[PDB]
Design a binder for this molecule. Structure first.
Ligand SMILES: CCCCCCCCCCCCCCCCCC(=O)OC[C@H](COP(=O)([O-])OCC(O)COP(=O)([O-])OC[C@@H](COC(=O)CCCCCCCCCCCCCCCCC)OC(=O)CCCCCCCCCCCCCCCCC)OC(=O)CCCCCCCCCCCCCCCCC
Ligand SMILES: CCCCCCCC/C=C\CCCCCCCC(=O)OC[C@H](COP(=O)(O)OCCN)OC(=O)CCCCCCC/C=C\CCCCCCCC
Ligand SMILES: CCCCCCCC/C=C\CCCCCCCC(=O)OC[C@H](COP(=O)(O)OCCN)OC(=O)CCCCCCC/C=C\CCCCCCCC
Ligand code: HEC
Ligand code: HEM
Ligand code: HEM
Ligand code: HEM
Ligand SMILES: C/C=C(C)/C=C/C=C/[C@H](OC)[C@@H](C)[C@@H](OC)[C@@H](C)CCc1oc2c(O)c(OC)cc(OC)c2c(=O)c1C
Ligand SMILES: C/C=C(C)/C=C/C=C/[C@H](OC)[C@@H](C)[C@@H](OC)[C@@H](C)CCc1oc2c(O)c(OC)cc(OC)c2c(=O)c1C
Ligand SMILES: CCCCCCO[C@@H]1O[C@H](CO)[C@@H](O)[C@H](O)[C@H]1O
Ligand SMILES: CCCCCCO[C@@H]1O[C@H](CO)[C@@H](O)[C@H](O)[C@H]1O
Ligand code: FES
Lengths: 99, 49, 241, 66, 49, 181, 62, 365, 73
């Protein structure tokens, strides 16, 4: 099962050990920055704290107690609806620029 | 309430001389600054050499 | 042949990290170079003054320099002339140029020895092995005239006939001049010749190690002191609910 | 006047590894020696022998030198 | 270079069509027992042994 | 890339009435680049050993293609440098430009550094003026009480101007112009 | 009531920036003589009988 | 100030971030020891080698300044390679300007060290000058002309040595100016960090945190340098350069400085002139392509297992190529080197971009 | 980039102690070693294999080379 290696991969990647959610780890390009800017207060503030908690653990070269690791089954893409729309908007503009 | 905010316990990090919350820490301040500054002065001497 | 015989590691007294050269051994080694090797090998980067305070006193070195004649000039008539050597003179060359050297040695060129130990993998282990390693050619090997079999020389055929053997010279201190003793001393001298800074860098290295033993943990302590502010900091997230 | 190099070499040649090598060397000497024509020579066998003997010499020799 | 007979014969026997820079030995020498060359490797300039 | 090339040149505001006397600043920049360019090319053929310095200079002028023009351009460029330096300083004194204190004092340092630089360059060909100029000027330091003489011998690398002096002067003359820049 | 050692050092040499720099200048000077003498002694002992200074007597006699 | 003192820095950058300052120190060290050596060095072929022995034997402490310069060049490369490796692993290359300037810096340092090695005019000096300048002869139609123009003649000779002293003298100062530009572009973004995630929510001031950490790093660099200078000054050098240059004879086991061995192995693996030169150039220039080959949705390799495995395979492969470069062109080294050379380009151009895509898939984006 | 203009943060509290009030080496060995061991173990499978491969290729190639230089490999 692909899905089997997936949970394996999730744990090997290890951002969960720092308490991060997958979307907290995306490389920030202009599309992503615009998507983060569009996030509602709570999603934005939560993201900030998880990243801050992760940077702090990294500085101490530490990880969270296993019970606090982000769980694979509970990780959800809070950024997706926002980023997808930002990309759609840019593509629409790019199409128009070619006509 | 902001009055529900209390500073976390740091006893695991404190130098022993400031572990008693019922004692003045000023009694040991010169000793504590002397220790760290001694590390700094010695280092500077070694670097000058 | 393309076969290689690498030299073993001899326990030179200057082998250790903080071990200096044996100066009585440098002194005997100089005698070897002087009496034996100098007739075919030059040592263009060493002057008599370099021996002072190393293996000879200033007067002994002065007397050594005077044992030879060196060219100087021009004088007021525009001519060159000979004079006794002095401390500032470099060791005399046995030949005016490499062509004359090759001519005098069946076409082979005795290399200059000032850096021979640093110019050869194996250094003195190599030189000692070469000097004390001449032997008969193995069955089936026949060398052209002028060549000698030496298992440690690349290709095993060298243009230098065995230069040392028991009693090849007499040492100033009565040390028995056995071939191995002579090789050991000349090799020690050649190390000094290639690296006169040998003893001083090790004395300095001792001081560097001691200073680092002191400075590294102290600076590290300074690093941990400043960083403690961050290493023990505590975070709390209090969003409005 | 005896060179300790002689003494030490003699002692070192007693080691199993040196005798084995000397044997292969003499086997090559005999083999090559008996043919009026042959490309082969005993360089390899000689070097193997020397490598074993000299490793041993290096550990003892300097004790006998000044 | 003063060449021997065996050397001269070995060079004559070469399959010229198989060379990357095809030339018969006799197109490169005047007197076979003598080969004269600029001793500089055509790759990057070192001296061939 | 744009800005500071940019607003530091293209749209730089300038007085509408500055005269030709204000041209010497850019002319000094050009003299510096000229000296640096001809200097590097001369340095590609110059050798600082006393046995071969003078010779290497004649080799430049006689055998290096266009070596003579590069050499005389360097020699005469040093003269143009000073003509411009003196015109530049004169302009400043006459028009009160010195009230720009930082600019002015840096300028004084620039004048001294160019003088020291030109001095050392003149020593490089190792002709008679080279040698006695090296002797006299370094000796100015001997007027310093207590250590003057020690400082001189340290600069010379010996008890008199010789090989050690010429070789370090080539190094000093080589780097100073870039420091001036 | 006798204060610790680092405490006395703080008050006597580290508290004032002037006095703290003096201590490092003078300290370095004492440290220098003791360290060089000590290290030189260690080096010469490790190499006893091998250095020119050790055999020199045999060849001089001014 | 604000370019140092209150410069915002990530709270979590590791020791891998110490190499930038260490490179600055290696550069200053080379410049300082370099100038002092230049005060006693003469570039005429009749006296170059001699002047170097004069520095080591008679100039007060000339030997320590010389070996500090020689070993300093080795430390420079150790740091450069660590610095580049950090960049690849953590995705620092996404700072495009900073990265590309870095590539220029690597090439300039390589060219600089090459020319310095020629200065003592020993055997390696001479043949290195011969081989490396001849790389240009691979350029069609005008290649040979370019080489003779660089040489100032039909072979490496006096004209070559003298101009190389001049080039080697000025290039490090140019490197210093290029490095300042390197830092200015970096300052526009601030540093990346081990997580590859923006650290704007947790910045700390450069002083005192990284000033003290950089000093600790500087001390360790000096220890490594001085262990080499005082205890094994020739360990990383080549005995053949203690032999004066001989234009009639190329040493039989000639080999490049250790920091050039991997590239030399790559060039040697191709039995074609132009092909070998193109592979050599590409083995370095490919660094400029890394940004375009980034497929991962994440910046750093910290959270990417597959990418990490391929990264260490690349490092192990460069170690293989370094070893092969030190071996004779004989079996089975010829084949191991060819495989290693192919593996190098394959990991960078194909395997890593592919691992990036697979990892994205496994994370469902 | 200057403090005051980096980014937006809300509702985060940070507590800190003066370096003079705390130890510079708290549980250095008692907690440091376990952490080093953990970090070492967590990466070993990713770092070591390629180098083991190098070792094998290195020993194999070197032996193969020597063997090829003699009469009876
Ligand atoms: C050859 C190449 C030569 C190139 C020149 C040398 C370049 C050196 C690179 C810079 C590295 C030094 C540096 O500044 O990093 C500080 C680096 C960070 O260690 P730290 O200050 O203890 O930080 C604690 C960790 O973040 C928290 O981690 P931890 O709790 O697991 O503790 C780790 C620490 C303590 O753990 C134990 O070992 C116990 O172990 C050590 O690093 C010692 O310390 C060193 O590596 C050098 C210490 C030497 C004294
Ligand atoms: C160029 C030719 C040079 C020849 C190559 C020489 C070979 C030398 C190899 C030895 C390198 C030392 C490796 C020791 C470090 C091992 C280690 O700790 O790895 C694990 C560790 C885990 O870290 P994180 O994923 O961030 O998570 C942290 C959780 N607390 O990974 C790292 O530290 C990654 C840092 C890598 C940077 C250095 C890479 C080594 C450099 C080699 C050259 C690189 C290639 C570029 C050359 C192109 C031309
Ligand atoms: C003289 C020439 C130098 C000799 C070189 C030989 C090599 C010897 C190596 C030195 C041994 C390492 C010692 C380095 C100093 C230790 C240091 O700075 O770490 C401080 C550290 C901090 O602990 P925390 O609990 O986190 O904080 C304090 C809470 N109350 O304390 C310790 O671990 C040791 C405690 C004893 C104090 C040590 C002395 C401090 C140094 C002062 C300089 C002394 C004089 C120089 C002469 C040296 C002989
Ligand atoms: C002339 C009769 C010689 C005397 C006396 C010594 N050597 Fe010699 N040496 C000589 C020649 C002709 C050569 C060239 C050999 C060749 O085939 O190339 C040499 C060479 C050496 C070497 C270098 C070997 C190498 O690896 O290239 C060394 C280290 C050497 N010789 C040392 C040496 C010493 C220390 C001597 C005095 C004991 C000595 N040689 C005497 C000719 C002659
Ligand atoms: C402020 C810039 C400079 C000034 C004022 C200057 C001045 C001088 C002077 C006055 C001389 C003697 C000329 C003569 O032969 O009569 C000289 C020589 C020399 N300079 Fe410069 N120089 C400058 C920059 C440079 C630079 C940057 C280099 C090299 C990188 C350089 C290299 C040389 C060389 C090689 C000589 C010797 C050859 C010669 O005499 O022409 N100079 N310089
Ligand atoms: C003379 C050579 C060089 C010097 C002096 C130098 C110096 C620096 C300095 C001071 C830093 C900041 C500290 C750090 O993060 O390490 C830095 C960062 C960086 N350098 Fe270099 N550099 C040099 C060469 C290079 C090379 C060769 C590359 C890569 C091809 C490069 C790529 C980078 C990148 C991408 C960063 C950002 C690192 C990050 O924030 O993660 N540098 N450099
Ligand atoms: C990026 C910085 C630099 C690097 C990487 C570098 C590297 C080198 C190398 C590899 C050598 C060969 C060392 C040997 O084995 O003898 C050398 C020689 C030399 N370098 Fe540099 N160098 C640098 C900067 C400088 C500067 C600024 C100068 C002088 C202004 C300089 C002056 C010399 C001199 C005169 C020699 C010849 C003497 C010797 O071989 O030690 N170098 N350099
Ligand atoms: C290592 C570097 C060193 C030591 C640099 C020192 C630089 C010093 C000054 O520059 C700042 C200096 C050049 C500058 O004084 C302000 C000049 C105006 C001094 C002019 C000057 O020239 C002479 C000259 O050229 C000669 O040539 C053959 C001969 C000379 O008398 C016989 C002189 C002389 O009697 C004076 C005063
Ligand atoms: C006037 C200035 C000029 C012409 C500058 C040219 C600069 C070129 C490159 O730097 C950018 C170059 C140094 C760099 O190529 C990317 C190196 C990795 C090339 C490495 C290299 O070294 C060798 C070496 O050192 C040797 O020493 C004795 C001998 C060598 O073979 C016999 C080589 C060799 O076969 C190669 C490929
Ligand atoms: C680099 C190796 C990747 C292989 C895919 C991992 O596959 C996973 O391995 C786990 C532990 O063995 C199993 O428990 C799990 O069921 C399996 O799907
Ligand atoms: C820092 C550890 C380096 C490994 C030590 C071996 O170092 C190597 O030794 C060879 C000869 O012994 C040299 O020819 C070669 O250039 C050198 O890199
Ligand atoms: S094989 Fe490359 S120069 Fe000859």
């Amino acid at each position: 099962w692909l899905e089997g290696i997936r949970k394996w991969y999730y744990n090997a990647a290890g951002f969960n050990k720092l308490g991060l959610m997958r979307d907290d780890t995306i490389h920030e390009n202009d599309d992503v920055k615009e998507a983060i800017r569009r996030l509602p207060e709570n999603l934005y503030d939560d993201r900030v704290f998880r990243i801050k908690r992760a940077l702090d653990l990294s500085m101490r070269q530490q990880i969270l107690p296993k019970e606090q690791w982000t769980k694979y089954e509970e990780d959800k893409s809070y950024l997706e609806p926002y980023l997808k729309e930002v990309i759609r908007e840019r593509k629409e503009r790019e199409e128009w620029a070619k006509k | 309430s902001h009055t529900d905010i209390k500073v976390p316990d740091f006893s695991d990090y404190r130098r022993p001389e400031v572990l008693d919350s019922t004692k003045s820490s000023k009694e040991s301040s010169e000793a504590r600054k002397g220790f760290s500054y001694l590390v700094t002065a010695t280092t500077t001497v070694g670097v000058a050499y | 042949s393309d076969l290689e015989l690498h030299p073993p590691s001899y326990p030179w007294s200057h082998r250790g990290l903080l071990s200096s050269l044996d100066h009585t051994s440098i002194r005997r080694g100089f005698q070897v170079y002087k009496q034996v090797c100098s007739s075919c090998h030059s040592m263009d980067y060493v002057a008599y003054r370099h021996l002072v305070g190393v293996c000879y006193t200033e007067d002994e070195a002065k007397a050594l320099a005077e044992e030879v004649e060196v060219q100087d000039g021009p004088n007021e008539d525009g001519e060159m002339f000979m004079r006794p050597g002095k401390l500032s003179d470099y060791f005399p060359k046995p030949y005016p140029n490499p062509e004359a050297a090759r001519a005098a040695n069946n076409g082979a060129l005795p290399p200059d020895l000032s850096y021979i130990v640093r110019a050869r993998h194996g250094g003195e282990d190599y030189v000692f092995s070469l000097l004390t390693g001449y032997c008969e050619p193995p069955t089936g090997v026949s060398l052209r005239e002028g060549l000698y079999f030496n298992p440690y020389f690349p290709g095993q055929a060298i243009g230098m006939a065995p230069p040392i053997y028991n009693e090849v010279l007499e040492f100033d201190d009565g040390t028995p001049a056995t071939m191995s003793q002579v090789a050991k001393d000349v090799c020690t001298f050649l190390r000094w010749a290639a690296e006169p800074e040998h003893d001083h860098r090790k004395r300095m290295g001792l001081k560097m190690l001691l200073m680092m033993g002191l400075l590294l943990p102290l600076v590290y302590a300074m690093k941990r002191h400043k960083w403690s502010v961050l290493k023990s900091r505590k975070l709390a997230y209090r969003p409005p609910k | 006047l005896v060179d300790p190099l002689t003494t030490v070499r003699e002692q070192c040649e007693q080691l199993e590894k040196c005798v084995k090598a000397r044997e292969r060397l003499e086997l090559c000497d005999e083999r090559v020696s008996s043919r009026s024509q042959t490309e082969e020579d005993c360089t390899e066998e000689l070097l193997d022998f020397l490598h074993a003997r000299d490793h041993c010499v290096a550990h003892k020799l300097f004790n006998s030198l000044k | 270079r003063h060449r021997t007979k065996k050397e001269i014969d070995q060079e004559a026997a070469v399959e010229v069509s198989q060379l990357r820079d095809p030339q018969h030995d006799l197109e490169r020498v005047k007197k076979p027992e003598w080969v004269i060359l600029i001793g500089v490797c055509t790759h990057l300039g070192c001296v061939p042994i | 890339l744009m800005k500071i090339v940019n607003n530091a040149f293209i749209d730089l505001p300038a007085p509408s009435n500055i005269s030709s006397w204000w041209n010497f600043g850019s002319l000094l920049g050009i003299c510096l680049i000229l000296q640096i360019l001809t200097g590097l090319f001369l340095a590609m053929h110059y050798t600082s050993d006393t046995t071969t310095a003078f010779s290497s200079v004649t080799h430049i002028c006689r055998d290096v293609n266009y070596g003579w023009i590069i050499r005389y351009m360097h020699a005469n460029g040093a003269s143009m440098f000073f003509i411009c330096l003196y015109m530049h300083v004169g302009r400043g004194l006459y028009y009160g430009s010195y009230t720009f204190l930082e600019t002015w004092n840096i300028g004084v340092i620039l004048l001294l550094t160019v003088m020291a630089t030109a001095f050392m360059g003149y020593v490089l060909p190792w002709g008679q003026m080279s040698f006695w100029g090296a002797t006299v000027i370094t000796n100015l330091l001997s007027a310093i009480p207590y250590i003057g003489t020690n400082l001189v011998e340290w600069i010379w690398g010996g008890f008199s101007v010789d090989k050690a002096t010429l070789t370090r002067f080539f190094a000093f003359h080589f780097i100073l112009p870039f420091i001036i820049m | 009531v006798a204060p610790t050692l680092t405490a006395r050092l703080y008050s006597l040499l580290f508290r004032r920036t002037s006095t703290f720099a003096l201590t490092i200048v003078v300290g370095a000077l004492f440290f220098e003589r003791a360290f060089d003498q000590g290290a030189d002694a260690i080096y010469e002992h490790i190499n006893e009988g091998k250095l020119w200074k050790h055999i020199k007597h045999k060849y001089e006699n001014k | 100030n604000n370019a140092f003192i209150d410069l915002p820095a990530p709270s979590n950058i590791s020791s891998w971030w110490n190499f930038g300052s260490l490179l600055g120190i290696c550069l200053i060290l080379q410049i300082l020891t370099g100038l002092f050596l230049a005060m006693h060095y003469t570039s005429d072929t009749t006296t170059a080698f001699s002047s170097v022995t004069h520095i080591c034997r008679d100039v007060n402490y000339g030997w320590i300044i010389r070996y500090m310069h020689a070993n300093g060049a080795s430390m420079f490369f150790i740091c450069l390679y660590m610095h580049v490796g950090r960049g690849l692993y953590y995705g620092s290359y996404t700072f495009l300007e900073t990265w590309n300037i870095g590539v220029i810096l690597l090439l300039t340092v390589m060219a600089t060290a090459f020319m310095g090695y020629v200065l003592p005019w020993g055997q390696m000096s001479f043949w290195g000058a011969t081989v490396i300048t001849n790389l240009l002869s691979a350029i069609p139609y005008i290649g040979t002309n370019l080489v003779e123009w660089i040489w100032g003649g039909f072979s490496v000779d006096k004209a070559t040595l003298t101009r190389f002293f001049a080039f080697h003298f000025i290039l490090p100062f140019i490197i210093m100016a290029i490095a300042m530009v390197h830092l200015l572009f970096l300052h526009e973004t601030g540093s990346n960090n081990p997580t590859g995630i923006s650290s704007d929510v947790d910045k700390i001031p450069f002083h005192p945190y990284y000033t003290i950490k950089d000093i600790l790093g500087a001390l360790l660099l000096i220890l490594a340098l001085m262990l080499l200078v005082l205890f094994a000054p020739d360990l990383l050098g080549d005995p053949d350069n203690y032999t004066p240059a001989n234009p009639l004879n190329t040493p039989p086991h000639i080999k490049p400085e250790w920091y050039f061995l991997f590239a030399y192995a790559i060039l040697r693996s191709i039995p074609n002139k132009l092909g070998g030169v193109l592979a050599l150039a590409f083995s370095i220039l490919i660094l400029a392509l890394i940004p375009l080959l980034h497929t991962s949705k994440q910046r750093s390799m910290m959270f990417r297992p597959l990418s990490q495995c391929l990264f260490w395979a690349l490092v192990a492969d460069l170690l293989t190529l370094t070893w092969i470069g030190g071996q004779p062109v004989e079996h089975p080294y010829i084949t191991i080197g060819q495989l290693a050379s192919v593996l190098y380009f394959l990991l960078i151009l194909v395997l890593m971009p592919t691992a990036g895509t697979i990892e994205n898939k496994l994370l469902k984006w | 980039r200057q403090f005051g203009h980096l980014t937006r943060v809300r509702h985060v509290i940070t507590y800190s102690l003066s370096p003079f009030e705390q130890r510079a080496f708290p549980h250095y060995f008692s907690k440091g070693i376990p952490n080093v061991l953990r970090r070492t173990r967590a990466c070993i499978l990713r770092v070591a294999p390629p180098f083991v491969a190098f070792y094998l290729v290195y020993t194999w190639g070197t032996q193969e080379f020597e063997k090829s230089k003699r009469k009876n490999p």
